[PDB]
RNA sequence: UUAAUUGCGAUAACGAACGAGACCUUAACCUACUAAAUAGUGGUGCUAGCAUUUGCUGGUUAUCCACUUCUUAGAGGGACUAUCGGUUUCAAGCCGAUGGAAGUUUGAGGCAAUAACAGGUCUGUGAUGCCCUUAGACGUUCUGGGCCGCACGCGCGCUACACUGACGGAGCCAGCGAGUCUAACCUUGGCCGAGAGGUCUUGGUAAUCUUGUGAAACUCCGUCGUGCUGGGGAUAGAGCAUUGUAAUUAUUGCUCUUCAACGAGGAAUUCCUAGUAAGCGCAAGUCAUCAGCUUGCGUUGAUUACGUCCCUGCCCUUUGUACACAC
């Protein structure tokens, strides 16, 4: 039949995903994980402290398989939310870049993501191949 | 400065945070004969936390006492198997 | 060529175009199946009309929709929409009028709005207040 | 689903920097009760003293709570960032401390007796109990003391 | 002397003033016309700008 | 409400002064006739003396 | 090398501020508004007046002068910008003329009432459909009034208003 | 020979006459061509208090001015390039051509 | 799960249960407003029911560990059997008393 | 009777005018016209992955070809309460249903009469009469303060007082608009930095680039757990950055720490009838920097009337008046 990225659902796809990168341990995470709290709207850390980048990773992943090309701005800008203000109203407010810079790296190192014309980095055809087969893996898991 | 209420006190309960022997059997014999069952139903009917309530919740449901009905988050829904 | 038509649902500001052509029975949304809508209630409201008019109506043709505007559950309902406009219009092209006038005789009777987009329009906010109606405030001492 | 029964080395309340921290709370919320401490700081202890951040406070070793005052008063010989200090640069010393549960205090008068005796405005205001940071003062902080 | 009027007006409202009156406060600084806002109204039939609704 | 103006009036009854046989109780005729052979400046001022012209034409049936 | 929206306001601006001067200056010769054409390798000011001899001067002297004028304010280059005059037609019709014909009236010392009833004859002489003055101030006391002087019959609300009365 | 005529005015009837005659001069002469295509009318709004003073009630003004723009692609020679940007001169209306 | 028939049939007979019959209005009458007991319209009956039965599950939800869909299936079900510790019930029975004593 | 001195009619009045309405703008409909690499769509080539059995999901500017459904416009059409049934001297009209994109003058505005207020504004005006001042000037400019000053009293608001919740991960969708020339604007992308931000380049005078403004609320998983608590984030201390000539009575932004009142608010009182209220953010204005403000935009989207003159007032008629700066 042949399936996609887009053939399953985004949550557990990147759950699936994340779980194979920790398993992998290929990922060259930076070392100020952990420190962190990957937004200056943000208020806490991540909670899954041991992991998240896999998280993170994996999330990108899928969105440059999605997109076209994107970069550290426009991750920041999907990433960023509301911060809390005090006492004034909210704001929206853009991610870290180190963190999405990073991992963009990290990506590249490993071989999922490669840098793009017209800027960015696009999805390359080893990362095409890894995702559809976790995606095949990750929807005949309930067979 | 002038309040225009009354705030008056409450109970102040003191659910439980860790679990002994007598409440894990206490639990393990008495989730049977409760029709619906939830975070809050523990949380009244044992005085424990809602973090007790969700793992126990989880416990129950591995191995098989409850069944779930609809496990979606901030609301669990479990029956008893019968 | 092939047989195939283009319809189009709408709703406040989200548009979604369908494309309808003869096929082995495929309903993508966004390069995604139908399944995957994510308001997964909104899911069911956007399945209830292939579940009206049955699947049997699904098995030959395919249908990939393209979503813009709006918000979630608009995007949902300009998708039924379209979906039910571009069955009605392959069976108004290629199939008889009789299939087509019990078809959108069993749309319309559910909903209305299944077919014909909502009128309902946003009223501009006019000055010395934040919405369209609601003033700010009178105080008078 | 882990369950575990527990046994009765249990304490309701444990005793850290001279403060009566609580138990029966998780970890590193319960140390967020030692002035000083708030939650970054205290998860990030948590996170560099190896204890699990999911056990609660009054079940935790002697060992283990004195690592962490350990890391805490001693804060960047155990990779800690030293911009997470709420004292860094101090005006004497120079170098990158962190205040704890009556440092705080001692140091806070430390540095408003400074600007007093150097008759600084801050401190003028600080004397007179105003607002400090330009704030008006014509409407709000009526009832302020 | 030099010094006499020699304070910057590379900003504020000071470095602007009505194209027509010479004032500093209503500036319409939009699409670059700086004209105050009362001279706006009384000069936008000629201007170009009409209202519609 | 619905009231329609002495102008609409007036040009209807006009209109069924002069061109009776003309005209008939059809609104999308009346009005095909009423743009011919009036100048109104307004589409919907036309088509509302042709409505009033219509009604008047379905009162002169009745007596 | 500007956005078109700029470029668009900067004619406006530039019309409203030459027609103030054009305004300021050539009352006296029945100034009742100008109109601009740029054009390749030209612009052209064609201003419609009465007094079109008065507006030239001797051998178009005083046109010579306004040129170079607007060059200089302007920032045109020499022979670019152009200026062409033009006895204007129904000078009846036009509320700008009639009003600096009053306001000269008035300064010559003429009576409120001939001057408005004078010049709202010669309006609705002119084929006017209405026309309607009023003169507001201080007359005859300290105490202010407005009075009114019309004949016909004139609409203030609508389209039309922009259509046909002219103000 | 690609050239491109913009038109940028306000008055819509008179850019509407420029484009038509324009278009009927091109296919007079045979010429290949893009026809009109007309950008979305960009609307200036400014916003501003009807008092001169403070006071009165809040009331608010819009003055817009609508703004069109088409443009019409062509191929041909410089001679009828040349009698086209010498002839179409409207007034209140602003051209522009563009070669390559 | 609890009551094991149909959930919206427990929902209609709750709001045929808690809906108020008969209710009070607020007439002049002169310086001391006076209530005067009239009928209630279905239609009303009906909106009543719902706010009532909502109002409750939203104030008994409001700051306790029960959620919000519990309560109300607990105020549902007591609705729907009749048994004055529902807040709609006890709204109801206040509102036909008043409507009573100011017949 | 109408929303309406809007009309039917009556009639010492007849015939008119202004206002209302008509009008104009905008929002809705057009698979009917004109079109369009500065908007798209489909196919064709070239190419990536999975399935391979055709296929599915993608990318591709000089790969062309075709079209305009979606997008933009211009020219038009369309609704006039149409048809039907009731009701009304049986007229103006009103009510219900059907059809229809639209049946509250279709929705929202713009414009908007006469007469006035001794309303506001000489601090918008090189609009101004008169008075004052006019050279140790009340002109103008420079330095530094002040307009923020705080025992208190009021008016717009913003945050909240928590599980219909806070936080952490993912998922992930708008519209209105603005933007640099003799200037230095909106900034993509790469790199550095926890962050704010910095640096090297790039595109855009703009349906093309910023920008699909990947907005927030929202959804799904978890953590928390009725504890002023992981609510709430004032008041403070220390440090790092940016704008500017200059930030000290912190310009703002960021990091850590400090973690107060507030437990749903008395007498009173405001706004509101549908895509409206309310929630949610975004753009623009002022702007070197500074939104808790305003002007608009879209996103999610209720309840309750479809009435009355009781209060507060408004319009018309009659009536009484010792009122006329008029209760
Ligand atoms: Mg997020
Ligand atoms: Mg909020
Ligand atoms: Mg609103
Ligand atoms: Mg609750
Ligand atoms: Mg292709
Ligand atoms: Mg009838
Ligand atoms: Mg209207
Ligand atoms: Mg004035
Ligand atoms: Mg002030
Ligand atoms: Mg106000
Ligand atoms: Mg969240
Ligand atoms: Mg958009
Ligand atoms: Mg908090
Ligand atoms: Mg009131
Ligand atoms: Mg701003
Ligand atoms: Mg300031
Ligand atoms: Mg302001
Ligand atoms: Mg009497
Ligand atoms: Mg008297
Ligand atoms: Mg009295
Ligand atoms: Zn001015």
Not at chain 6, 38 to 49: C, D, E, F, G, V
Not at chain 7, 119 to 131: I, T
Not at chain 8, 44 to 66: A, D, F
Request: charge should be positive; proline fraction near 3%; charged fraction near 30%.
């Amino acid at each position: 039949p042949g399936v996609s990225v887009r053939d399953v659902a985004a949550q557990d796809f990147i759950n699936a995903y994340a779980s194979f990168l920790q398993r992998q341990g290929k990922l060259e995470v930076p070392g100020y994980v952990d420190i962190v709290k990957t937004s200056s709207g943000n208020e806490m850390p991540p909670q899954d402290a041991e992991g998240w980048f896999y998280k993170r990773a994996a999330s990108v992943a899928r969105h440059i398989y999605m997109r076209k090309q994107v970069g550290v701005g426009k991750l920041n800008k999907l990433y960023g939310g509301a911060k809390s203000r005090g006492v004034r109203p909210y704001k929206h407010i853009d991610a870290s870049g180190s963190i999405n810079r990073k991992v963009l790296q990290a990506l590249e190192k490993i071989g999922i993501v490669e840098i793009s014309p017209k800027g960015g980095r696009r999805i390359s055809e080893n990362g095409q191949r890894d995702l559809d087969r976790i995606a095949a893996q990750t929807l005949e898991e309930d067979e | 400065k002038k309040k225009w209420s009354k705030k008056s006190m409450k109970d102040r309960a003191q659910h439980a945070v860790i679990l002994d022997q007598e409440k894990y059997d206490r639990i393990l014999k008495e989730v049977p004969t409760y029709r619906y069952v939830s975070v809050s139903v523990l949380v009244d009917r044992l005085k424990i936390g809602g973090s007790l309530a969700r793992i126990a919740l989880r416990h129950l449901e591995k191995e098989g006492i409850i069944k779930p009905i609809s496990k979606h988050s901030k609301q669990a829904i479990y029956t008893r198997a019968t | 060529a092939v047989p195939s038509v283009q319809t189009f649902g709408k709703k406040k500001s989200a548009t979604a175009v369908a494309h309808v052509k003869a096929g082995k029975g495929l309903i993508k949304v966004n390069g995604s199946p139908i399944t995957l809508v994510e308001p997964e209630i909104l899911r069911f409201k956007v399945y209830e009309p292939l579940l009206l008019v049955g699947l049997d109506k699904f098995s030959n043709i395919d249908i990939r929709v393209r979503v813009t505007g709006g918000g979630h559950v608009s995007q949902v309902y300009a998708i039924r929409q379209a979906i039910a406009k571009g069955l009605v219009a392959y069976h108004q092209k290629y199939v008889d009028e009789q299939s087509k006038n019990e078809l959108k005789k069993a749309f319309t009777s559910y909903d209305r709005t299944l077919l014909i987009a909502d009128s309902r329009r946003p009223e501009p906010k006019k000055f010395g207040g934040k919405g369209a109606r609601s003033r700010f405030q009178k105080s008078y001492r | 689903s882990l369950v575990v029964q527990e046994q009765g080395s249990f304490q309701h309340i444990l005793r850290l920097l001279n403060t009566n921290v609580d138990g029966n709370i998780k970890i590193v919320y319960a140390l967020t009760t030692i002035k000083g401490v708030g939650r970054r700081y205290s998860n990030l202890v948590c996170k560099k003293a190896d204890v699990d951040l999911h056990k609660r406070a009054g079940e935790l070793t002697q060992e283990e709570l004195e690592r962490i005052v350990q890391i805490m008063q001693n804060p960047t010989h155990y990779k800690i960032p030293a911009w997470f200090l709420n004292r860094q640069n101090d005006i004497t010393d120079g170098k990158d401390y962190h205040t704890l549960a009556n440092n705080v205090e001692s140091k806070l008068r430390d540095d408003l007796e400074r600007l007093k005796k150097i008759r600084a405005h801050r401190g003028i205001r600080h004397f007179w109990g105003l607002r400090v940071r330009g704030q008006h003062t014509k409407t709000t902080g009526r009832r302020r003391a | 002397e030099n010094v006499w009027f020699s304070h910057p007006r590379r900003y504020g409202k000071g470095s602007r003033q009505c194209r027509v009156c010479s004032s500093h406060t209503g500036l319409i600084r939009k699409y670059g016309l700086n004209i105050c806002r009362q001279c706006f109204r009384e000069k936008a039939n000629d201007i170009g700008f009409n209202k519609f609704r | 409400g619905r009231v329609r103006t002495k102008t609409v009036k007036r040009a209807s009854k006009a209109l069924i002064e002069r061109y009776y046989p003309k005209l008939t109780l059809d609104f999308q005729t009346n009005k095909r006739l009423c743009d011919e052979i009036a100048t109104i400046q307004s589409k919907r001022l036309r088509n509302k003396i042709a409505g009033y012209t219509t009604h008047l034409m379905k009162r002169i049936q009745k007596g | 090398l500007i956005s078109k929206k700029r470029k668009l306001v900067a004619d406006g601006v530039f019309y409203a501020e030459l027609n103030e001067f054009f305004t300021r200056e050539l009352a006296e010769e029945g100034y009742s508004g100008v109109e601009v054409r740029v054009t390749p390798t030209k612009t052209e000011v064609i201003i419609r007046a009465t007094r079109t001899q008065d507006v030239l001067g001797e051998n178009g002297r005083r046109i010579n002068e306004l040129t170079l004028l607007v060059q200089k304010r302007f920032k045109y280059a020499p022979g670019t910008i152009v200026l062409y005059a033009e006895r204007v037609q129904d000078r009846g019709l036009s509320a700008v003329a009639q009003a600096e014909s009053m306001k000269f009236k008035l300064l010559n010392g003429l009576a409120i009432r001939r001057a408005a009833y004078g010049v709202v004859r010669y309006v609705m002489e002119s084929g006017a459909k209405g026309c309607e003055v009023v003169v507001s101030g201080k007359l005859r006391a300290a105490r202010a009034k407005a009075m009114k002087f019309a004949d016909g019959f004139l609409i203030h609300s609508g389209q039309p208003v922009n259509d046909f009365i002219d103000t | 020979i690609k050239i491109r005529i913009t038109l940028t005015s306000t008055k819509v009837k008179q850019l509407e006459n420029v484009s038509s005659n324009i278009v009927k001069n091109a296919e007079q002469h045979n010429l290949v061509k893009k026809g009109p295509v007309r950008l979305p009318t960009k609307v200036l709004k400014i916003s501003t208090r009807k008092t001169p003073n403070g006071e009165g009630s809040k009331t608010w003004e819009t003055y817009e001015m609508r703004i069109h723009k088409r443009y019409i692609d062509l191929e041909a020679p410089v001679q009828i390039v040349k009698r086209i940007t010498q002839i179409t001169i409207e007034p209140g209306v602003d051209v522009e051509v563009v070669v390559a | 799960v609890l009551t094991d028939q149909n959930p919206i049939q427990v929902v209609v007979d709750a709001i045929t249960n808690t809906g108020p019959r008969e209710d009070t209005t607020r007439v002049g009458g002169g310086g001391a407003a006076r209530r005067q007991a009239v009928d209630v319209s279905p239609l009303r009956r009906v909106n009543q029911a719902i706010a009532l039965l909502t109002i409750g599950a939203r104030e008994a939800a409001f700051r306790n560990i029960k959620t919000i869909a519990e309560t109300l299936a607990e105020e549902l079900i007591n609705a729907a059997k009749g048994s004055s510790t529902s807040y709609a019930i006890k709204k109801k029975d206040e509102l036909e008393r008043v409507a009573k004593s100011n017949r």
